[PDB]
Amino acid sequence: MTVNEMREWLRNWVANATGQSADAIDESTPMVELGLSSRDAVAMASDIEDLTGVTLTATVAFRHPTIESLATVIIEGEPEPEPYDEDEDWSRTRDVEDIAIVGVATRFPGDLNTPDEMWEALLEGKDCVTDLPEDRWTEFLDEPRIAERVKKARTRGGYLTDIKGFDSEFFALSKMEADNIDPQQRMALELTWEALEHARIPASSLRGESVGVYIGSSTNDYSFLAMSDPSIAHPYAITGTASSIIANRVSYFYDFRGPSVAVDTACSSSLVATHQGVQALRAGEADVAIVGGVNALVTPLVTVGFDEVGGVLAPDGRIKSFSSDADGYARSEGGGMLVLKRISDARRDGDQILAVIAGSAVNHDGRSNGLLAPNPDAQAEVLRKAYKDAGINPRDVDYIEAHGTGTILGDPIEADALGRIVGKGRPADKPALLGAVKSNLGHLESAAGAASLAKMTLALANDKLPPSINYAGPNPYIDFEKERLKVNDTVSDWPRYSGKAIAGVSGFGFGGANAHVVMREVLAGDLVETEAAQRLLEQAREELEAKEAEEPTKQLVPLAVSAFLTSRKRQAAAELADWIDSPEGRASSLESIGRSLSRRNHGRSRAVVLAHDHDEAIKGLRALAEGKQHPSVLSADGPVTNGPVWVLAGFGAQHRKMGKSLYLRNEVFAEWINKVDALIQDERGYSILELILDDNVDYTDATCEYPIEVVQLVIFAIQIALGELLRHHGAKPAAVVGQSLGEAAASYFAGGLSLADATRTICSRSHLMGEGEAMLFGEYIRLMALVEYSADEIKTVFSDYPDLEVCVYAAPTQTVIGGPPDQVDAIIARAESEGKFARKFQTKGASHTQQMDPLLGELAAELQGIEPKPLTTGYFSTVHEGTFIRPGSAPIHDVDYWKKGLRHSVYFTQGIRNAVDNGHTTFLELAPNPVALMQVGLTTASAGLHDAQLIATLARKQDEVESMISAMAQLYVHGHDLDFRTLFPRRSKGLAGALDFANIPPTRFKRKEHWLPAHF
Amino acid sequence: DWSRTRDVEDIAIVGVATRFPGDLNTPDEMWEALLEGKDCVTDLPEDRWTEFLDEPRIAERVKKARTRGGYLTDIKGFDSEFFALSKMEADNIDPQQRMALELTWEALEHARIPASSLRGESVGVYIGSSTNDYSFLAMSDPSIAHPYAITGTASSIIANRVSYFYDFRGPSVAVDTACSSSLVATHQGVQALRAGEADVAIVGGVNALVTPLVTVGFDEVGGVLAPDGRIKSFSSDADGYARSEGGGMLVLKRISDARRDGDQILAVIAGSAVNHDGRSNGLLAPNPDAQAEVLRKAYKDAGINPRDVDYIEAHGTGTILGDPIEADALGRIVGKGRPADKPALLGAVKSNLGHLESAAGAASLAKMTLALANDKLPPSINYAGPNPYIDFEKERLKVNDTVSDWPRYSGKAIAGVSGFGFGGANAHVVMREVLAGDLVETEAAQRLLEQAREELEAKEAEEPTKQLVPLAVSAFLTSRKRQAAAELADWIDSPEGRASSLESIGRSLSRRNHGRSRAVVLAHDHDEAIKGLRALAEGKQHPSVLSADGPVTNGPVWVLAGFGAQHRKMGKSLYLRNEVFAEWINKVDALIQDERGYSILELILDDNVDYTDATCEYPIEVVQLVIFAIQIALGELLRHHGAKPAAVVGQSLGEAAASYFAGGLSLADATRTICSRSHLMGEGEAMLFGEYIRLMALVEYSADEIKTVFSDYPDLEVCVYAAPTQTVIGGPPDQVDAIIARAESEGKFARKFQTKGASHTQQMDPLLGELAAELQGIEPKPLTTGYFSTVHEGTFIRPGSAPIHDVDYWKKGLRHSVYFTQGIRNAVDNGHTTFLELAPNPVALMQVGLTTASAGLHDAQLIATLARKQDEVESMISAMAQLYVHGHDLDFRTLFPRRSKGLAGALDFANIPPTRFKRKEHWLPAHF
């Protein structure tokens, strides 16, 4: 609450974490030298957050290494920068949101294929410009004139290591089609996949969504190879070399439904694409934006032309941005992608924001001193427009990612423009830092903007400024002191003139098109915005805590491994098993690995490994690598045709402590149980939660006043809670089939009735059954028994028994019947003559018989008032002879329907047979104990389905939390609707969520050579 | 609910340019062809693809293909001189860029927006292109290929060169969505316009069939190209399409801007949307669900219920498989809920023009804009019967195969334009017709004014005067200007020209491009205009023709003279016949009434006031006040038409006006200064009479030569150096005639002024104290214009300098001499050649000419505003015409204001000939 008490609490916390003197560790020394590391900093930040309510980021915590600074910044916040006087208002005129960058994909010279490699190269100041590879441009070196012309040119630049490799099998392309595809499209596809993986957004979750694609390209270089011989050219080249296909194929493969356009502004194509994506996101029209640019050096025509122009290409191939010896640039090939979302959407979806885009603008030079001559006035105007759109004063910019082409004539113009706009009004001791990534990677023609954006995103995320290389000294024609600019040639921290990191990215095409993007770091403000049963709950929680203290239980972590092919899934499982056994895998929590796996792409072939620790996970993954079956591994080669069917059974499925363990260890289950308990209290005037939380309640005559009613009410509540818990994780039934007491739950889940109506129906039924049985005793009782007679075979035996009635056809070869006890044992004795199976039920409920006749009038009066609704799900009404009802049909759940269901028999096996005939193979039962799964299996086997999926939710003598995890795992494996990300919720937003994810291996591709054989 | 969720404006279409097969180069020709149902698909021209027909394999492969489609008549022609391109550079330019430039110019002309007025403005360019076909010719021989092809064949250059040539400062991007490129470009332009970021948007698409590679590939695909080359949209015998080449452009502005600028709105764009098919049944297979979604999104953005759509411009590629999908989507969205008797009319322009790959959207938008503007629906051709696989009655669709009126189900015409690329990109644009709601939102002097107006009306009834209509003809070269003038003269003499009012021709000419070489013809009727244009055609000089070969280096200098420039009826004619002049005269009169307690408007409107002793109580003061008012009114009238001075130089009584126009003082401060000066001069002269009077005289002595003669005259003082060889001096009458007699010995020129004002001498000494007290309170301001202060020895003062117009400055100006010729010499030395005088009568123009001639400038531009015995309305028109001719700042459109908005403005413009281009053959010599 105050600075001093916060400091004392922090000292106590570090003392507890280290065991030191606890009273002499308040030094000015940093926590790192006190004995702490980066591992416990996350826990300390979480403890600070849950006590104070403020969220601290990584940069803020690291910039304050000592106890006093952290204590001051937690209470008083970050110090406010001193005000400055400006003659203009730079606030936003429009009401628009900020754009959050969540994923980065890089394909750059120097084997920079991941953002981490690119960041390491930038920190090391690596030069990625090399000579022309010996295997490149071989189609043109066989002609003596072309060969001698190429040797005269520079031909030095940034080249990709493997430009011919492509995984055509992954993208479902034939060899003939794959050979005619521009490498730009291959790079676009690969970078889209890699950016989606980096953002930790599953690709399967974006199918059918409004995702926009904006890719910038400049030249169709691969077309020339196709048309080298016009007759041998294949028609596939029309689609494989077109510029619009670069984005159209990305949209098609990933099933994106947003805008898909390819832009062309020469050297500002990537920045223009990013600007268009941002403008699309701000104006609705899209939810996720994929922006970037690609460039490939397929043929030497452009390089030879630029060399013939003269004074454009550097003799040594190095780009010396803003240096005294700048003499041109060199052409490079590569590509990059970014994933853009609205900041509110990113905050609500739990995405990790890498950087924030505040605004951007584009314009043209106009009538300059020639078509290829840059205009400083237009650059100043675009800077002003971009900073007006971003709502940020240009005086507060810390770093400028300039064009940096290394020309002796264009660098002074760019510096003059920056001094006109960015550097105007700055004090001499606060200059804007300047640099360019073209000094490292070369001039990526249509991908310069993508490289610059990736570099600045990595710099903002990692809180460091990479140096600029090939800088011998200041340009004599540029007065950096007057322009208030400084070249950053070393590794340095963000100056943070305005208190936060602000950067600008510039890029100008040779045709006069200019663009500028304003970026800022993510801030902390972007990540924000029943009395008796109570004692039983308290004592149950306190007893559960005592048992956990004696022995902590091991959580079951489901590990999801999937791919588009079974062999690829096995290879990925083997690689994951290898990674987990490594020391890095051992140092990561099993929950983090599961969370990282749950946000990967969920392919056609899926598998789930249920493990408690690292060793079990390794063993399961090793088993999954081969075809060996394992009890801890669930796998399938593909999804099933139709959705699952929920079976609302539950007769004879009660036990002593059903639902108690899941109530304490799950919040959605507890919430729905409390809701149903409140509804029953409103209806029946007593709480079922007291019975559930009680330990010594056997749901029998010796422990319950109304054993018949309470069992049905508790089973109904458990079914409703389990169904809603399944709906919480994204599961939904394709069809619903109910049984004698599960009809209310079936109606509720099918949309026929609301929760209150179904609760009133089940309460009325149970209470009438309980009350009516009390008066019926002595010789008027009716007993129910199970026989091995089918639907038609039982007609013959019933000729000898007039009073016997059929209760429910559980199985094709089994039937439940009820009647007078002297008449029930008679048919049982007759059945025993053939050596069949016959048993007498021990419950005196005696439903679906003549005994329920007096209760129809009372049932009708109590049920008068319910409002039936049209069904939103397929329904197999066992009351209506198991007839399937299409969704959207007329309401059926009227009073007469319930009267018929309570009075007449239940055609359970007919509904299951109809469901099998409709193509349903997965059956899920919501019950405290699986009792009807055997009946469903018997019905399916007789129907010609020997491999049906029978899934249970809760079972006796089984852990209820693990049982539900396994039930959802089976649904996920068979391709049913289930959000696997919901199984690993995030509890932290800022620095406390640093260890939420593990560094699992990425997806591996089998690249094959695909190229056009051409000669000249 | 289909109402708009966002608060955005509508986009108005003001200009259309067409370059389509069938020689449809103008919107009128295209509309006539659409009404006639013309088929524009022909065979391959004999002069096309000749670079590839010399190879036997390629030649035999081409003959196997279809090769029928829409081709341009002259694809190699290009006016490189007009666009300032060398032959080497012009030969390497993609014809797509040439079409983009030509269509931009033609669309700007059609919109009646001068191209020179958009230079430096935020104008966005969005052009859709699909293939770089001209690149293949360049790289046919890699060694012979020139580096110019890099810029001449790049796709971004298609828009970058348009932005560069026209000096556009807005976004310039080239889009690529195969067959929806034009629609996507239009959508991007609309979104840019709605989000600020731009004021004018140029959208469209181009396509050229340079090489047969794409056609041969599509033929080799099979089942794509129609065997006969005709597109039978929604017909029972649809068997493919044919590829065509062409382009089109549209000029887009916000509807409020178009309304305020007086532009003629042709059609209104309500909304648009774009999306993608996603994972369809193959990459090239269209998806009906995505098309339905894009229709819903576009109609949600437009804020219009799809049930109210009258006509749908469908994709209409003529495929037996895609037409049912498009019809199904239209029935899902557009046709859902309609009654059986109100179907949505269906058609496609591809049946007429063929399949313009990257220009289908431009052609469809042009067709729908023409249909909305002309209130007619053109028929759809090649329609033998309904498609058996399409149930038009169920889908509530009907093919319009005849000329029919707009059904107007919702009371207004609403149309939709659809276009889908083969890659899965879909687009839809919703258009509506322009509605009527889019084009909306001093007592005594009074009697003198009434009687003057009634007498003027009586004279006009006896004989109506003929208005002077300035005709502006301009071009980038003098020869082109002469050719255009000759063509205009030929057109005017034609019966169509005779049936058009001369004012309409002038209004049409004033909204054309104002080039480097300009000329103005001042005419009263058609015959005078014809004679002037004929004279302008040759190099013959004509008094009614003002011409110049180019602009001057520096701006004009306003001379605030006026001493001895008064006459009986100065400013009376212009007051009655001009509203801005009258408004500013009334404002100055009100200021003087506040200051001096009497109205100068009564003197101006009075007829028998000679501004002398026999007609005015205070002849000295009233003349100065009226001259100051006239100068202020003339300057503000010139500012109304866009004129602004580059520098200002004043004289003895014009210093207040010079300070006001230079930004030093406000109107009230200058009015108070001039009123105080005039009243003090008038009052002081009354007490000075008898032998103490001072007389002013003009002599032929220079600044330094007058020093020697002044040794004999101690009391004589110098008043103003009017000319390098002339000087005005003042002193005692017995001492003034003495030096005059001495000057007459050499036979020089000497005259005595008849005005007893005697300013800038010792007589004004007692008035300094009174002047300081009255002037105490003025607030000087920094100068916003160059100033040649004749008080400060004619020293030039840069704009933005410290204020100079304090009380001491006025005291020194009233007491000391005026260095008029020094300021003019400094202005000449600064590069100023144009001098404009604001006065009721040009008196100092002779002095300015004498000074400039002595300074080495024998061709200076001396322009007068008002003159004696001259029509004041025609004098001001001629003065602004000279400013326009010499390239000075002047909005020539302000000379022809529009008084009507709707149907009453139908005859505001004439059908003057368009700009003519000299097209030359520019092509790359290639062989295989």
Ligand SMILES: *P(=O)(O)OCC(C)(C)[C@@H](O)C(=O)NCCC(=O)NCCS
């Ligand atoms: P430790 O050596 O395991 O370090 C872990 C870490 C907390 C530094 C890191 O994994 C993390 O989650 N935060 C990184 C913050 C960052 O890179 N930017 C700020 C650097 S000062």
